[PDB]
């Protein structure tokens, strides 16, 4: 949850992890905490339709301007529809859900656009695995600043993609972990409490400060 994420971020940030005499960032690495999902591609068509995105497992989703969300699974037929009040429906495109046909068409447009024009983030990352019987998250909300796009997934994860240098953070409050993707596309997953104890480089530290500000904002607009 956001409240938990805020506590976790406040704790590591208050410890001033980059203002230590010797930094041992490597000691905070925990590959067992790598996220299952993150946003790999996105398109902002919120001028007219909404925000379309791809998850790392190749599923696609859209957060429509009317606050409903639709997800198309990587098998290309399965659907999960989330209504304004959070009601979830599991359907198939092949079944021809009458009320959803226009939304399905828009989603396929997004899927095709992203596949033809956009680079998959975390292409070199292998997500962890857990269950499978019920587990695809949808986009709860998002916003953009002059510096980044902030994506909040229904599984509690918060992702921040920085525009200027292509660096990215994937924060998970369940694992209390952060995955940092650097400008070279190299990545690491760190336990936040271990960064507090062992320190980290400026850069990750500055991005974690920014993340806290973004989380406070998400909580303010709750």
């Amino acid at each position: 949850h956001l409240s938990d994420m805020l506590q976790q971020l406040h704790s590591v940030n208050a410890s001033k992890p980059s203002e230590r005499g010797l930094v041992r960032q490597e000691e905070a690495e925990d590959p067992a905490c790598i996220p299952i999902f993150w946003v790999s591609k996105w398109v902002d068509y919120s001028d007219k339709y909404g925000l379309g995105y791809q998850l790392c497992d190749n599923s696609v989703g859209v957060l429509f301007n009317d606050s409903t969300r639709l997800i198309l699974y990587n098998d290309g037929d399965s659907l999960q529809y989330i209504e304004r009040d959070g009601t979830e429906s599991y359907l198939t495109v092949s079944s021809h859900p009458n009320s959803l046909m226009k939304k399905i068409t828009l989603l396929k447009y997004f899927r095709n656009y992203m596949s033809e024009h956009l680079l998959k983030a975390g292409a070199n990352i292998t997500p962890r695995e857990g269950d499978e019987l019920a587990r695809l998250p949808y986009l709860r909300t998002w916003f953009r600043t002059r510096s980044a796009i902030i994506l909040h997934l229904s599984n509690g994860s918060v992702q921040i993609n920085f525009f200027q240098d292509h660096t990215k953070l994937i924060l998970c409050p369940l694992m209390a972990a952060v995955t940092y993707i650097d400008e070279k596309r190299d990545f690491r997953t760190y336990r936040l409490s271990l960064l507090e104890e062992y320190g980290c480089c400026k850069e990750l530290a500055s991005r974690l400060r920014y993340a806290r500000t973004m989380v406070d904002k998400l909580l303010s607009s709750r």
């Binding site: 591609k41 996105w42 398109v43 902002d44 068509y45 024009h117 680079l119 993609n161 525009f163 292509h166």
Partner: peptide, 7 residues
């Protein structure tokens, strides 16, 4: 940008 990083 109105889209994520191009191919």
């Amino acid at each position: 940008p109105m889209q994520s990083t191009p191919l």
